[PDB]
Ligand SMILES: Nc1ncnc2c1ncn2[C@@H]1O[C@H](COP(=O)(O)OP(=O)(O)OP(=O)(O)O)[C@@H](O)[C@H]1O
Ligand SMILES: Nc1ncnc2c1ncn2[C@@H]1O[C@H](COP(=O)(O)OP(=O)(O)O)[C@@H](O)[C@H]1O
Ligand SMILES: [Ca+2]
């Protein structure tokens with residue numbers, strides 16, 4: 018008789034409003050502690066939070082917290098609705114389990130990722146997005162206030178401990194396991210979200226530390242900290258106002274950097290006024306709700322709830338698996354993985370399956386790093402050398418093997434279908450070296466081991482066909498790059514006649530520090546007249562060169578598109594390409610200066 | 616004594632006296648009540664108020680708040696007694712008959728106006744251009760309308776409405792700026808982003824070519840000073856924001872741009888009058904104020920129309936007030952003084968009368 022047929026019981030007297038347990042059965046147990054779903058005969062759907070086997074009474078105290086909040090502050094729609102302590106069947110045993118209503122929907126991380134995604138795709142607008150965010154913050158801060166009335170501090174508010182209800186669109190806080198009473202030392206905490214004071218010294222937990230958590234939880238979701246594991250929400254935002262606070266993709270579109278702000282706004286003031294300040298200077302839950310950010314951009318409560326119902330009944334944006342940027346730390350981490358394979362090859366304990374799988378992810382990481390910035394060319398060449406050294410150890414060392422390596426061939430063949438740029442030259446060379454190493458392994462294992470099967474033989478020729486298509490493509494692009502170098506050098510020669518005169522004139526115009534001002538036309542009139550006069554002087558200084566500069570950019574812009582913005586094998590090409598880009602910016606800014614300032 | 620002309624928009628209300636070159640009062644169509652003020656004062660005291668727009672997509676939806684805007688317009692902006700001046704109001708194309716009666720009833724019963732007329736907004740912008748035949752693309756804060764007009768009369772079967780206008784562009788600009796690390800989010804910040812939009816955006820004649828330029832170099836970047844002194848720099852956002860007018864997909868809309876919406880309105884008209892509509896495409900409202908929009912509409916409509924036809928776009932310099940100027944012209948005409956609905960006519964026939972006279 019399986020566990021799905023066994024009954025449940027009560028450990029204490031349950032709470033008033035608790036259901037009858039007769040008929041209830043376990044349906045599944047999900048993914049930490051183990052949570053099982055209890056299907057009732059009616060199907061209300063309950064959650065049973067089973068105790069850890071380590072058994073420090075964290076679970077019984079959690080019940081007593083819920084109990085106490087209900088008696089002192091009342092129930093609250095955005096807080097879990099708990100019924101008591103049950104005994105439930107799990108893993109050939111009965112265990113104690115905290116019994117409560119299922120919040121049927123998604124966790125806060127999944128909801129906010131999905132909300133942000135529908136906004137970027139254009140399914141909802143900015144009013145709706147930021148309205149809904151502010152709506153959530155009001156609910157969470159209302160709950161931290163509700164707990165403060167009971168004299169309970171939560172201590173572990175974070176994305177996993179908030180769950181959204183699909184039916185109502187309401188966020189619900191759960192997981193009081195690490196709760197303390199006010200001014201007692203906290204039972205535990207999560208380090209990425211923790212407020213600085215929380216857990217250190219005489220003064221322990223307060224409502225202030227809860228308010229902090231509520232914000233670090235929102236910041237996490239809003240900025241998308243999951244995409245960048247090297248930062249943690251309780252450090253708040255970094256400001257970059259002199260340079261770009263963003264990265265550019267292939268096509269000139271900026272991309273938000275998680276944790277980086279380019280200007281102070283109500284939103285950045287919210288983060289700084291709470292996360293960037295001590296407990297006594299930090300607002301409590303009701304003051305935080307008065308903040309500019311939460312006071313100003315709000316939408317109707319039913320409007321927000323509606324948007325959240327719609328997000329939750331739609332498709333969940335999946336967790337991004339390898340969109341992580343290639344930083345010196347991550348690239349260091351990947352080198353340490355290769356260093357263990359070389360370490361195990363020396364000791365004759367090299368898993369051949371996993372080194373070829375991991376080498377393929379190294380290739381993708383390196384191609385990714387070349388497209389973006391992030392790491393200097395010396396850290397790349399050292400990584401590249403470490404790959405080549407690892408291919409060196411395989412050849413030197415010496416149909417399950419086919420299934421490991423086919424994914425690698427398919428990825429490369431998908432890459433052979435695409436339209437390439439010059440930044441693909443190094444990418445394709447490396448890919449050729451991979452296919453060659455795959456070919457050598459398979460053929461070599463048939464010498465002293467298992468003979469070649471029909472699948473292997475056909476695979477060898479699929480690798481061989483790809484190697485040649487790769488060679489032809491790699492050879493066309495090297496020819497095209499030589500045309501591009503010559504075209505580059507000619508364009509530079511033309512610039513001689515005007516470059517320095519134009520660079521100087523525009524440097525002087527830029528030192529006046531031109532800028533569109535906020536305000537009325539009357540208020541900005543003197544300012545606008547001053548710029549136009551400066552702009553008129555600059556265009557008079559370069560009059561003789563105006564046709565040259567206009568014709569120069571008709572040629573240079575299409576060439577700069579072709580040479581791209583990423584690293585290239587040829588380092589002289591890159592230094593030259595940047596000199597064209599700088600000359601192009603001078604010419605094109607002067608070609609538009611009248612339109613922009615007069 | 617001078618007539619009053621008021622043009623009620625989704626974003627802005629424009630008010631003045633018949634005979635003036637421009638309206639004397641321009642303020643936001645916003646009412647704010649406790650958690651009661653109108654216009655800029657409602658915005659300044661937003662912290663203790665819940666702000667609402669009584670006009671949505673050109674059409675009146677909150678009559679209580681609309682009554683407040685008119686009371687504000689007369690008593691605070693124009694500082695006049697509505698019992699002593701006749702009043703010209705404006706309305707959107709395809710305004711429900713029920714709304715027209717409610718408008719009439721409020722002027723006569725709440726404000727005691729001696730007389731009133733109501734006019735279709737697009738038709739006033741065509742009168743303002745010196746025309747009685749033409750097609751109008753009116754685009755404001757809440758709505759865009761292509762209105763073909765023949766010899767004075769709008770052709771309601773060929774009118775198209777597009778819920779894509781300035782408010783949606785301001786909102787889109789707020790989104791795309793967050794990629795540069797700029798998080799504008801409050802209604803105060805929304806107004807600042809509207810300022811940026813109005814001063815930095817333009818329509819590219821060739822979008823893909825400007826995108827290329829913006830990616831190749833930094834020569835389209837341009838900086839803006841916020842009211843607190845902070846400075847931001849923006850790039851392809853400048854021309855990408857108003858491109859949404861031609862590519863509604865940028866706003867998540869599965870819909871035709873203004874160029875193609877205009878084409879379709881012309882095509883719903885009789886073949887015999889199309890040539891004239893094509894040669895008298897007039898443009899109206901603040902959302903048609905983008906540098907480069909007139910040339911783009913010329914390019915884009917010439918692409919869809921027969922090669923025989925001559926496509927001529929008219930784009931008056933001060934066209935955010937074209938509707939109001941039309942009304943000032945019309946009320947000021949001597950021939951028009953017969954057209955007003957009088958207080959006597961309303962006291963004798965009730966709100967229903969409006970449909971007979973307008
Ligand atoms: N120079 C400009 N460039 C771009 N947009 C502008 C400019 N000036 C005003 N706008 C925009 O035009 C809109 C105001 O235009 P208008 O007053 O004609 O609309 P409305 O009549 O209030 O609303 P609707 O016509 O939708 O009922 C606002 O959205 C504003 O941001
Ligand atoms: N009432 C509930 N409704 C829906 N999911 C729940 C509920 N209670 C817990 N969970 C889920 O179980 C997970 C872990 O439970 P939690 O109480 O946070 O235990 P722990 O202290 O081990 O983190 C949560 O992230 C959440 O997804
Ligand atoms: Ca209007």
Ligand SMILES: [Mg+2]
Pocket residue numbers: 177178192
């Ligand atoms: Mg948890």
